[PDB]
């Protein structure tokens, strides 16, 4: 009769891996982490669009006032990256549970998403999360937007890792990625 037992495909704590076969430039060979996936649609941010200024760059920017001594004066030194399109003037720390900030969602036991100030002034501390990367913008898909664009030979998915995060260079996040999905480039 009718019992309708399915899949749901959420794809939260998912990567999202651009196919060598990507139309849109902008996604040409981007790796994205949904943050959020429902019914409403889904967010995400792109994990190896490193940008110009450094994390400590737009802390200065921002004049955020460290709430201890920066030794970790070369984390400070790293890159942050371009999240998404959307809303491109705000910011998301994409990081590693370490304490309690404001606004903060949890992902996982290593994965952890915070959109408050606060977490800026333990950035470069000793504070600071063990692991993090700074988002400026986020991508988004409408309702089932993003449901329709997997149909279609763009991306392909994986369950996260938080080292392909927050650790393996930015240079090789999407190509170990794909390299995890068995497959390479073209030619």
Same mark, same amino acid.
């Given at each position: 009769?009718?019992?309708?037992?399915?899949?749901?495909?959420?794809?939260?704590?998912?990567?999202?891996?651009?196919?060598?076969?990507?139309?849109?430039?902008?996604?040409?060979?981007?790796?994205?982490? !949904?943050?959020?996936?429902?019914?409403? %649609?889904?967010?995400?941010?792109?994990?190896?669009?490193?940008?110009?200024?450094?994390? %400590?760059?737009?802390?200065?920017?921002?004049?955020?006032?460290?709430?201890?001594?920066?030794?970790?004066?070369?984390?400070?030194?790293?890159?942050?990256?371009?999240?998404?399109?959307?809303?491109?003037?705000?910011?998301?720390?994409?990081?590693?549970?370490?304490?309690?900030?404001?606004?903060?969602?949890?992902?996982?036991?290593?994965?952890?998403?915070?959109?408050?100030?606060?977490?800026?002034?333990?950035?470069?501390?000793?504070?600071?999360?063990?692991?993090?990367?700074?988002?400026? %913008?986020?991508?988004?898909?409408?309702? %089932?937007?993003?449901?329709?664009?997997?149909?279609?030979?763009?991306?392909?998915?994986?369950?996260?890792?938080?080292?392909?995060?927050?650790?393996?260079?930015?240079?090789?996040?999407?190509?170990?990625?794909?390299?995890?999905?068995? !497959?390479?480039?073209?030619?």
């Amino acid at each position: 009769s009718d019992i309708e037992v399915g899949h749901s495909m959420n794809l939260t704590n998912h990567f999202l891996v651009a196919m060598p076969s990507m139309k849109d430039p902008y996604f040409k060979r981007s790796v994205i982490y !949904i943050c959020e996936h429902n019914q409403d %649609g889904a967010m995400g941010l792109m994990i190896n669009a490193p940008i110009d200024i450094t994390v %400590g760059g737009m802390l200065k920017q921002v004049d955020i006032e460290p709430a201890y001594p920066q030794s970790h004066q070369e984390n400070l030194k790293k890159p942050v990256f371009n999240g998404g399109p959307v809303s491109e003037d705000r910011g998301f720390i994409l990081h590693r549970p370490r304490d309690h900030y404001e606004s903060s969602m949890k992902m996982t036991d290593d994965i952890a998403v915070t959109t408050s100030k606060d977490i800026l002034t333990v950035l470069g501390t000793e504070a600071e999360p063990e692991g993090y990367i700074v988002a400026l %913008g986020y991508s988004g898909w409408s309702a %089932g937007q993003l449901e329709v664009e997997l149909t279609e030979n763009s991306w392909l998915t994986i369950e996260a890792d938080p080292e392909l995060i927050f650790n393996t260079p930015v240079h090789e996040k999407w190509q170990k990625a794909i390299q995890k999905l068995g !497959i390479s480039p073209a030619q």
